[PDB]
Design an enzyme around this catalytic site. Structure first.
Site, short mmCIF file in Angstrom:
data_model
loop_
_atom_site.label_atom_id
_atom_site.label_comp_id
_atom_site.label_asym_id
_atom_site.label_seq_id
_atom_site.Cartn_x
_atom_site.Cartn_y
_atom_site.Cartn_z
N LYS A 145 0.80 -1.23 -0.10
CA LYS A 145 -0.03 0.03 0.03
C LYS A 145 0.81 1.38 0.04
O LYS A 145 0.40 2.16 -0.76
CB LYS A 145 -0.91 -0.17 1.21
CG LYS A 145 -2.00 0.79 1.04
CD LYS A 145 -3.30 0.27 0.35
CE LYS A 145 -4.50 1.80 0.39
NZ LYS A 145 -5.53 1.04 -0.39
N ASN A 168 -2.00 -11.66 1.91
CA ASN A 168 -1.26 -11.62 3.07
C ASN A 168 -0.64 -13.24 3.86
O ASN A 168 -0.15 -13.32 4.78
CB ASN A 168 -1.97 -10.90 3.98
CG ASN A 168 -1.95 -9.36 3.69
OD1 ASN A 168 -1.46 -8.93 3.11
ND2 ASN A 168 -2.94 -8.83 4.75
N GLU A 172 11.67 -12.54 5.84
CA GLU A 172 11.86 -13.93 5.43
C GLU A 172 11.36 -13.97 4.13
O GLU A 172 10.28 -13.48 3.81
CB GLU A 172 11.22 -14.78 6.41
CG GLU A 172 11.47 -16.14 6.02
CD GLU A 172 10.53 -17.34 6.42
OE1 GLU A 172 9.68 -17.22 7.67
OE2 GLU A 172 10.08 -18.16 5.73
N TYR A 173 12.13 -14.44 3.12
CA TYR A 173 11.43 -14.51 1.75
C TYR A 173 10.72 -15.66 1.48
O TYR A 173 11.11 -16.82 2.04
CB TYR A 173 12.64 -14.36 0.62
CG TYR A 173 12.30 -14.96 -0.71
CD1 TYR A 173 11.59 -14.32 -1.54
CD2 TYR A 173 13.14 -15.96 -1.04
CE1 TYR A 173 11.33 -14.93 -2.77
CE2 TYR A 173 13.13 -16.41 -2.58
CZ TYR A 173 12.20 -15.98 -3.24
OH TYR A 173 12.09 -16.42 -4.50
N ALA A 174 9.46 -15.60 0.87
CA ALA A 174 8.60 -16.63 0.75
C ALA A 174 8.81 -17.12 -0.72
O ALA A 174 7.94 -16.29 -1.84
CB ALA A 174 6.98 -16.38 1.15
N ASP A 184 2.06 -9.52 6.96
CA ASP A 184 1.60 -8.33 6.92
C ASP A 184 0.93 -8.02 8.26
O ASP A 184 -0.27 -8.20 8.55
CB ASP A 184 0.66 -8.07 5.49
CG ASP A 184 0.07 -6.73 5.57
OD1 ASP A 184 -0.13 -6.13 6.49
OD2 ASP A 184 -0.71 -6.47 4.65
N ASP A 205 -6.04 -8.73 9.50
CA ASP A 205 -5.72 -8.59 8.18
C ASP A 205 -5.53 -9.81 7.57
O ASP A 205 -4.64 -9.90 6.60
CB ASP A 205 -4.77 -7.42 7.97
CG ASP A 205 -4.73 -6.68 6.32
OD1 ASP A 205 -5.88 -6.72 5.84
OD2 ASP A 205 -3.57 -6.26 6.18
N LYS A 212 10.83 -5.16 2.23
CA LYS A 212 9.80 -4.31 2.37
C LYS A 212 9.93 -2.84 2.45
O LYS A 212 10.38 -2.50 3.59
CB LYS A 212 8.62 -4.88 3.25
CG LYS A 212 7.21 -4.08 3.17
CD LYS A 212 6.46 -4.49 4.34
CE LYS A 212 4.87 -3.93 4.22
NZ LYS A 212 4.26 -4.69 5.22
N1 LIG Z 1 8.76 -12.10 2.38
C1 LIG Z 1 7.99 -11.98 1.18
N2 LIG Z 1 8.32 -12.92 0.32
C2 LIG Z 1 7.51 -12.70 -1.01
N3 LIG Z 1 6.63 -12.06 -1.18
C3 LIG Z 1 6.27 -10.97 -0.40
C4 LIG Z 1 7.02 -10.98 0.71
N4 LIG Z 1 6.49 -9.85 1.47
C5 LIG Z 1 5.30 -9.34 0.91
N5 LIG Z 1 5.42 -9.86 -0.35
C6 LIG Z 1 4.59 -9.52 -1.39
O1 LIG Z 1 4.49 -8.16 -1.61
C7 LIG Z 1 3.10 -7.81 -1.45
C8 LIG Z 1 3.08 -6.57 -0.27
O2 LIG Z 1 3.06 -7.33 0.96
P1 LIG Z 1 2.48 -6.86 2.42
O3 LIG Z 1 1.02 -7.25 2.46
O4 LIG Z 1 3.61 -7.05 3.47
O5 LIG Z 1 2.50 -5.30 1.96
P2 LIG Z 1 1.19 -4.35 2.48
O6 LIG Z 1 -0.08 -4.75 2.06
O7 LIG Z 1 1.54 -2.87 2.17
O8 LIG Z 1 1.32 -4.22 4.07
P3 LIG Z 1 0.34 -3.30 5.04
O9 LIG Z 1 -0.81 -4.24 5.18
O10 LIG Z 1 1.12 -3.17 6.44
O11 LIG Z 1 0.12 -2.30 4.28
C9 LIG Z 1 2.27 -8.72 -1.19
O12 LIG Z 1 1.11 -9.00 -2.14
C10 LIG Z 1 3.03 -9.99 -1.13
O13 LIG Z 1 2.61 -10.87 -2.21
#
Ligand SMILES: Nc1ncnc2c1ncn2[C@@H]1O[C@H](COP(=O)(O)OP(=O)(O)OP(=O)(O)O)[C@@H](O)[C@H]1O
Ligand SMILES: O=C(O)c1cc(-c2cccc(Br)c2)nc2c(F)cccc12
Length: 259
Positions: free
Chosen positions: A17, A135, A85-87, A148, A130, A36
């Site tokens: 976001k 997530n 941690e990378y997924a 997240d 959430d 991130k």
């Molecule tokens: N460790 C990770 N490994 C692979 N992909 C990730 C990882 N972390 C996040 N992502 C990808 O990046 C995108 C953003 O992840 P995340 O939900 O943490 O950000 P966000 O939605 O901005 O969080 P928040 O809800 O705090 O705003 C997700 O759609 C996810 O697919």
């Protein structure tokens, strides 16, 4: 005790976001992680440091195989960086777009992994709030990993799509750990059907549908699943089961593939 020049940045992983997640490597250790990135300007213009500092606290203290590790943080001029941690197998969101819908085995297994990770969180009086397929990340063995923690907080308490939120949250009311069991039923349904039980073309219709608990199962949803979804999707948060009941549900135990 961290800096951007300690990391060799790679490919974007997903878009958040307030900023993108990038695949990266710690130069000295050759360690593969996800960074991130969040822009200070955007989080300010929204007033959510708040949570960003809450996300980091909550996430750095959680240790579970079904929860995403947060290795640290650091910042610069206009950016805030989280070392995660990378997924490697992406999200549950991308898998559902490919497969359209999941089989009872894949679903029950994900519902089991969710319940495990959730018990752990609730045992530290931590509510995710959430839980969405965007997530839910997948590790190298296809294991679910909750990510997240921006919206997570300590139980009890008082932006996006309303689909995964329980009526007590959408109605601004007071909420606890039972909020995460409503999400668990919304997810179970979505995993089987390919769409959430309260989806609509407007935020407005979704709100009516959630508050009334207006949901119908298509034909291919077995009695076993119908039962649990109906059990978890109760307007009265006291009427919802415990994660222990979920984990022990006949449809769950019968279809979940244990390690
Ligand atoms: N460790 C990770 N490994 C692979 N992909 C990730 C990882 N972390 C996040 N992502 C990808 O990046 C995108 C953003 O992840 P995340 O939900 O943490 O950000 P966000 O939605 O901005 O969080 P928040 O809800 O705090 O705003 C997700 O759609 C996810 O697919
Ligand atoms: O005023 C600032 O420099 C600022 C700092 C941070 C920050 C510092 C340490 C850990 C973490 Br998590 C965050 N965040 C900011 C932000 F999100 C928006 C605007 C300014 C800052």
């Amino acid at each position: 005790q961290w800096a951007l020049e300690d990391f060799e940045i790679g490919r974007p992983l997903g878009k958040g976001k307030f900023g993108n997640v990038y695949l990266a490597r710690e130069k000295q250790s050759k360690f593969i992680l996800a960074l991130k990135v969040l822009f200070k300007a955007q989080l300010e213009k929204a007033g959510v440091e708040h949570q960003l500092r809450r996300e980091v606290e909550i996430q750095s203290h959680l240790r579970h195989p079904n929860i995403l590790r947060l290795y640290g943080y650091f910042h610069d001029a206009t950016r805030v960086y989280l070392i995660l941690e990378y997924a490697p197998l992406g999200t549950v969101y991308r898998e559902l777009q490919k497969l359209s819908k999941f089989d009872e085995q894949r679903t029950a297994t994900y519902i089991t992994e969710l319940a495990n990770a959730l018990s752990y969180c609730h045992s530290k009086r931590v509510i995710h709030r959430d839980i969405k397929p965007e997530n839910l990340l997948l590790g190298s063995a296809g294991e679910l990993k909750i990510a997240d923690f921006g919206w997570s907080v300590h139980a009890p308490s008082s932006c996006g799509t309303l689909d995964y939120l329980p009526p007590e949250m959408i109605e601004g009311r007071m909420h606890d750990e039972k909020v995460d069991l409503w999400s668990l039923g919304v997810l179970c349904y979505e995993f089987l059907v390919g769409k959430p039980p309260f989806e609509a073309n407007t935020y407005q219709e979704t709100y009516k549908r959630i508050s009334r608990v207006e949901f119908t199962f298509p034909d291919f949803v077995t009695e076993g699943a119908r039962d649990l979804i109906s059990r978890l999707l109760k307007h009265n948060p006291s009427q919802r089961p415990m994660l222990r009941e979920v984990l022990e549900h006949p449809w769950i135990t019968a279809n979940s593939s244990k390690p």
